[PDB]
Design goal:
The structure is cut from a larger assembly and holds chains A, B, C, D and E. Chain D is α+β, with helices and mostly antiparallel strands. Chain D is built from three helices and three strands. Chain D is elongated, with a radius of gyration of 14 Å. In chain E, strands 1-2 form a two-stranded antiparallel ribbon. The longest helix of chain E is centred in the first third of the chain and has 13 residues. Classes of the chains: A little secondary structure, B alpha+beta, C mainly alpha, D alpha+beta, E mainly alpha. Strand 4 of chain B pairs antiparallel with strand 3 of chain D, so a sheet runs across the interface. Chain A binds two RNA strands through loops. It is classed as ribosome.
RNA sequence: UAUUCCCCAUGAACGAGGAAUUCCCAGUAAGUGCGGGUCAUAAGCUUGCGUUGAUUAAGUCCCUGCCCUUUGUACACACCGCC
RNA sequence: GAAGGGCACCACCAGGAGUGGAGCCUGCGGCUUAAUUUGACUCAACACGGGAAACCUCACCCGGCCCGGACACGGACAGGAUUGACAGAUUGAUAGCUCUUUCUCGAUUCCGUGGGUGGUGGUGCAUGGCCGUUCUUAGUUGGUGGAGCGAUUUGUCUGGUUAAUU
């Protein structure tokens, strides 16, 4: 038939990052939780919904996985 | 009730349609009322013409798949007994029976 | 059968809440359940590195919508909730540590729910 | 559950054989939607009898 | 014990409710007659049932692209123990006869 | 990558086809549209249908290929053979 | 390229119609082309696979996404297995398919192993069915006899007949 050469750029299958994720939660002295950064406008993602700094991206993850913006 | 009943007999088997068709005449004329006998529509020929060959090849021979469907119909005037007697009797094989109420 | 042994009164309520689909099961959903009436019952871990995480639990738990228990050990805290796919007949199933869930919509009623939530609200 | 999208509404994308899901030589006429072979199998049973 | 929980927990309890569950082989339905609270076409149904047979807690026919899912006596246990359902249970084949 | 159609506009070779060769006898060849099939779109495709409807054979095996009989055959992967 | 008999307009005679020439159509061949997927090779391959195809078809190429990895067997209780993620870098795509952020479903997940599951992948000289055809040609077979030790043979045929061992 042919036998596939492939231009030597074997594309990455990627991990979605490891991440413990939930350590960064400011417990100021007694039990109370609220940090500030950027926010999403969705309903299931109600006010707590939380954002970022990447090489750009930022995303919100709380209408289960329904609804990540474009920034 | 006395209303303008049409019985429309549609079936494939001419013989097993005209045993029923005769039994509605002989079923109504038993308990006489009226009729205007069996009407004979043109028979509709369901004609398909496909290749004999699955796949390509061989000299091109096709079959000529046919199904007929003759319609008789019989007018009458009766109550809700003579209809529900004559229709439910003389059923059985591959025969479809319609029952128009009146006129339209 | 099903007459409540030791640390198996929380186990039937967790196994029936598991299967009734509604467990606010962790620091996050636990706290967003305790933030609303979404919370009901819970099982916290005695062992907890940086016990700010057990404190966020305790502090919310102790508010109106009164929760608590204790249950010693991280290493036990899950296998009376839902977390095994049968693979291997003698159950060696899984194995890291365990911590703070929030049991919602119990399961249906009875079994262990008149045992633990009559005994917790009135420990006498 | 998202994406699997076009006109699957006309074109043979849409219509296929009711017996075997093959998508050529299809007897559209007369509300059959058999493949032309799936006639000669399921033909006598239907009613089309070869006369002349 | 798998997939979309809401949909698939409902597919089990549909199948336990019924003696027989027919289907169609068509991924692109977004529905299926009776149940279909939401979407759950072939896929979510098939993916479930083609699991059930291969492990053994259901049995097939196919017959002109459809899938003829018939519930096995062993599965009676698998799915009622999946669904915590009462130890009488009575799936559907209660069957008053004569 | 003129989809298909219309409206304009350009406006070709072909003035009966060199070597060959298929089709068939009665409502037949031919022309002729028309349906069906194919179809979202749509047919120069087929399969039917009439319609208009001829000339000519009505026999022979002269070519090609088929049947029997008799015969010859070193062929039986059968003469596209064997040698 | 033996002989008698017989027969077919896929044979001829006697013709007409054409066909083979032109343009065009589309069928194939080839070249070209990354790709012009492909089956089909005298006849009984060539507007045939119902094969009139933008997208589907479609398999094929230049890409590019997607996973729909059943099943079991293993591995994964929680400082939540990653079920499923609204503005931008991008990318074709408002493909979280991926590079931080993280906010939920929540017992699903993920990673091995075996094993599938398909596949318009392969092989029609591995096969079923269905088709094509030798071939709408007159042929084929047995019971009993009779002939041959027996394969075999007659019956199944010189001739007249017949569309046709009729």
């Amino acid at each position: 038939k042919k036998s596939y050469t492939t231009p030597k750029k074997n594309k990455h299958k990627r991990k979605k990052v490891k991440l413990a994720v939930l350590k960064y939660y400011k417990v100021d002295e007694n039990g109370k939780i609220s940090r500030l950064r950027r926010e999403c406008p969705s309903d299931e993602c109600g006010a707590g919904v939380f954002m970022a700094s990447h090489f750009d991206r930022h995303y919100c993850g709380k209408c289960c996985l329904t609804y990540c913006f474009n920034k | 009730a006395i209303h303008r009943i049409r019985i429309t007999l549609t079936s494939r088997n001419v013989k097993s349609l005209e045993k029923v068709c005769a039994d509605l005449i002989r079923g109504a004329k038993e308990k006489n009322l009226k009729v205007k006998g069996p009407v004979r529509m043109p028979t509709k020929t369901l004609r398909i013409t496909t290749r004999k060959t699955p796949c390509g090849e061989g000299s091109k021979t096709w079959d000529r798949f046919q199904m007929r469907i003759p319609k008789r119909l019989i007018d009458l005037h009766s109550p809700s007994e003579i209809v529900k007697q004559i229709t439910s009797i003389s059923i059985e094989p591959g025969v479809e029976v319609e029952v128009t109420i009146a006129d339209a | 059968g099903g007459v409540m042994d030791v640390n198996t009164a929380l186990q039937e309520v967790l196994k029936t809440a598991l299967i009734h689909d509604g467990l606010a099961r962790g620091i996050r959903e636990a706290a967003k359940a305790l933030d609303k009436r979404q919370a009901h019952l819970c099982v916290q871990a005695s062992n907890c590195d940086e016990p700010m995480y057990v404190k966020l639990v305790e502090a919310l738990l102790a508010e109106h919508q009164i929760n608590l228990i204790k249950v010693d050990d991280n290493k036990k805290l899950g296998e009376w909730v839902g977390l095994c796919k049968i693979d291997r007949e003698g159950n060696p199933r899984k194995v890291v540590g365990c911590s703070c869930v929030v049991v919602k919509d119990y399961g249906k009623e009875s079994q262990a729910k008149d045992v633990i939530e009559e005994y917790f609200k009135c420990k006498k | 559950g998202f994406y699997w999208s076009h006109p699957r509404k006309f074109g043979q994308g849409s219509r296929s054989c009711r017996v075997c899901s093959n998508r050529h030589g299809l007897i559209r006429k007369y509300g059959l939607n058999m493949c032309r072979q799936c006639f000669r199998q399921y033909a006598k049973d239907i009613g089309f009898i070869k006369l002349d | 014990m798998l997939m979309p929980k809401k949909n698939r927990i409902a597919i089990y309890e549909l199948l336990f409710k019924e003696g027989v569950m027919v289907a169609k082989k068509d991924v692109h339905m977004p529905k299926h007659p009776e149940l279909a609270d939401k979407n759950v076409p072939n896929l979510h149904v098939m993916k479930a049932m083609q699991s059930l047979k291969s492990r053994g807690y259901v049995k097939e026919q196919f017959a002109w692209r459809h899938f003829y899912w018939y519930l096995t006596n062993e599965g009676i246990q698998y799915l009622r123990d999946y669904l915590h359902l009462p130890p009488e249970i009575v799936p559907a084949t209660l069957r008053r006869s004569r």
